[PDB]
Symmetry: C2
Subunit: 506 residues, 2 copies
């Protein structure tokens, strides 16, 4: 009907290339021909069907998110199927690997996976990577560094496998209903937007439209119902209380004093606190100083904890921003409280982001496995050189925040935390402002402002060299670990550049 | 420092290409060198500054959204500035043009704009285009058609000029505070995701973080404060009450009976009603029918009006999905009601969307300038053939819905609505199911299911030929109008194909 007039348009007018004439309502939308198909096209009756429909092939990149924490079931469940279907040479871009992912070892041995990109490696899998399980070095990235690698085209995800506790038929999902109610799906939101194919694995179906749509319908290709995506009763349990380890309460009291006299403890300040140890417990002492002064916080950032929810509920922190809820109290507050807000990892920590909330932070509390006399921080490798930790958002929040505090005891048993040179640099010292330990406080000399402020308030300080010599005094000189020349992991700084390598341990 | 070892990685291992060694925390994030800048980098002190920083050149594509309706001030405001700065050959990709955009005529003559992409063209600007104002034919797209054009890469927005009533310094904007509280920002959300550079023109600053973030901080490059983006008094005004016209009420009653007996009027049906006339007033007779049966709808869709809001608060509609609020009542409901949900156009009507909600519609009420005996529908050109109309989501909801109902009086003064052949096909007859007029109902003969159901329920019917002849009896035979051979606009069907052209009127 229209064939001749399109020809003419192309010949006589300035028009867009490739104009074709109309040929029916369903020509490019065949599912519209059927009123069941257009509603139900995404449903998959089995995980195996999802994988076939997903178009996955040998050599491709696949992904997962880690909000199910230690009780994740999705990585292993999907890996097993891909192994049974005979997939080879895959790239595995889980945002993080926990020790319940030890079954990956056999998959790597059988050639199912040839490349790993991750922000965490622990348990038996870290041990095996350090012994030399793979020819290809693991690429280790910060949480925000992951997003940047994806956007840059280096890490291209072909199929995302995203576990969710509830979903509708169209793919609107969240973490507030179902069994494994994890809360924030902020890690999943990155894959939801950039993966070529997004497969949701849901525990429960929900009436369209599902609200909130943490993951939305226009992001989702395939959906399958499974039994469990995490550990329902562990994931929904409430916050564990602050530690009663008096050495950590000492560290946290000290760190609250640093904040108080830092120059940043004013009305409207923003903070990120940690999930355990002193870096969590600091909140107890801050709450007191905030009530003492007549001040409140503009926002709390991170993976939110119940203790931080608690301060929001008393009016002390005006809003919470949540890329991952760390307990079921946080998760339930994200669902119920309107200023407890879910954000993606792009809005959190990406150095290439147009808007990363971490760059608006006044204070962050970070931990450390080791810190050296250059204030360089190790969070990846144990004292024996073996991969045991997570790069995570450590270097992202440190870079972004105005004031970055490392809380670590001087010594852990026979192992010193302050050392001459850390085994692996994850977070550069140029990013670390204060070290707070149980044997004193050391300020980075690059921060003359802080030195002055803390000196003038009568906070007793030391040099990091003094803290180091004291650590060596209490633990002796530690004999170095036996490495081979073999590179086992590449530590990519958040901007994508390389900051260190991890070698194989004899 | 690391240069030596990265070399050794490139040569001895299988690693990603182009690995560079770490060189500082702010190497690729210079704004981090200033604690004030990492919060404020995006703020512009004027519109000129925002246009400078945006990197806009001649021959580039710019965009605007149309949520401020007839009261829009952004297009004129920005256009004035661009012309005053000497920009040439721009592509204008506003989602719809209203009659207050007549200042665009001078800009086109002076060559500020050389190409238009739009869904609507009305008022003086439509008249001038039809008279042959421009060498290049305007591209007319549906609401979802636009998204697909942007996704296909045919329409590439270089800079998006997005008016908002309020936002924080980081770019989190919504339509619920400030003055021009338009409500849903569904159309802007597509520009926000897809434009190379996104400029927000806000009228009010709010404290970080603005919740909800209809436009999110990781989508915004630049922000400037302006006096007004819309017409505050009119934008925020409540819903205009239903028709008092008994003709329209007659059409509404009959459309409600067609729906009742179609086979689609079941518990949990979805619907989209209109913004006026019978297509609005149908709700009034649907409500009583719904209450009569124990029926409630699963969701309403569209640009929501307050009458739809009202049925939701009554619990007769369980969810509302809102790509554009039409009254200040809908706007205010979007803000306060958790299940009055804001969605984007991609979620609404993109044919190439992974999940477009109009595709889950049982029933859609639409309207018509004309409709012919093939049920093809014209909503772009008036009876004199002049551009005075809008494509909109007309062809989108029609194509996705199970049942599409057109409501129009048989005759408008001297002008028949039912004709042999429409001047312009916008929506194809194959997606048009039923026509309801003040002279009777006619069902597309392609819908044998509909015919059987409406007959069995004793609904009196007519052929569309019976109505066409009756309208020709009431209006005489019309003087076929003097088009020239010049093509003035191209009608793009939602899939990007060309369904019709519009010729210059003599």
């Amino acid at each position: 009907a229209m064939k001749e007039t399109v020809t003419m348009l192309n010949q006589q007018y300035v028009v867009p290339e490739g104009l074709q004439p109309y040929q029916g309502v369903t020509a490019n939308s065949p599912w519209l021909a059927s009123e069941t198909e257009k509603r139900r096209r995404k449903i998959c009756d089995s995980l195996e069907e999802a994988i076939r429909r997903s178009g996955l092939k040998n050599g491709m990149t696949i992904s997962f998110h880690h909000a199910f924490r230690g009780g994740d079931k999705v990585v292993n469940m999907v890996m097993a199927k891909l192994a049974e279907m005979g997939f080879r040479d895959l790239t595995l871009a889980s945002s993080s690997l926990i020790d319940a992912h030890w079954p990956l070892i056999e998959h790597i041995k059988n050639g199912v996976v040839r490349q790993i990109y991750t922000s965490g490696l622990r348990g038996k899998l870290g041990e095996e990577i350090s012994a030399g399980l793979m020819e290809n070095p693991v690429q280790i990235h910060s949480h925000g560094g992951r997003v940047k690698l994806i956007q840059s085209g280096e890490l291209n995800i072909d199929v995302a496998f995203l576990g969710v506790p509830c979903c509708d038929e169209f793919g609107n999902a969240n973490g507030f209903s179902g069994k494994s109610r994890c809360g924030s799906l902020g890690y999943a939101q990155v894959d939801a937007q950039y993966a070529k194919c997004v497969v949701l694995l849901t525990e429960e179906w929900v009436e369209f439209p599902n609200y909130p749509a943490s993951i939305a319908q226009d992001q989702v290709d395939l959906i399958v119902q499974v039994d469990e995506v995490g550990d329902p009763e562990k994931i929904t349990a409430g916050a564990i209380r602050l530690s009663s380890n008096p050495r950590e309460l000492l560290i946290a009291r000290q760190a609250a004093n640093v904040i108080e006299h830092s120059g940043y403890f004013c009305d409207g300040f923003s903070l990120q606190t940690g999930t355990g140890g002193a870096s969590l417990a600091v909140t107890r002492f801050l709450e007191d100083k905030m009530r003492r002064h007549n001040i409140t916080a503009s926002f709390g950032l991170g993976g939110i904890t119940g203790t931080m929810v608690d301060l929001h509920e008393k009016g002390l922190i005006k809003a919470l921003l949540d890329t991952q809820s760390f307990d079921g109290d946080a998760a339930r507050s994200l669902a119920q409280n309107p200023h407890h807000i879910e954000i993606s990892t792009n809005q959190y920590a990406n150095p290439a982001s147009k808007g990363a909330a971490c760059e608006r932070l006044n204070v962050v509390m970070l931990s450390a496995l080791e810190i050296d006399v250059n204030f360089n921080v190790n969070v990846m490798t144990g004292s024996n050189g073996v991969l045991r930790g997570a790069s995570g958002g450590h270097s992202d929040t440190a870079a972004g925040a105005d004031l970055t505090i490392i809380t670590a005891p001087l010594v852990r048993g026979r192992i010193p935390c302050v050392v001459e040179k850390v085994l692996t640099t994850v977070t550069p010292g140029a990013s670390v402002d204060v070290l707070v330990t149980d044997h004193g406080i050391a300020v980075n000399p690059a921060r003359q402002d802080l030195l002055d402020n803390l000196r003038a308030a009568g906070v007793a300080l030391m040099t990091i060299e003094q803290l180091q010599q004291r650590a060596e005094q209490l633990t002796g000189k530690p004999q170095p670990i036996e490495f081979t020349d073999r590179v086992v992991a590449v530590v990519r700084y958040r901007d994508g550049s390389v900051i260190d390598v991890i070698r194989q341990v004899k």
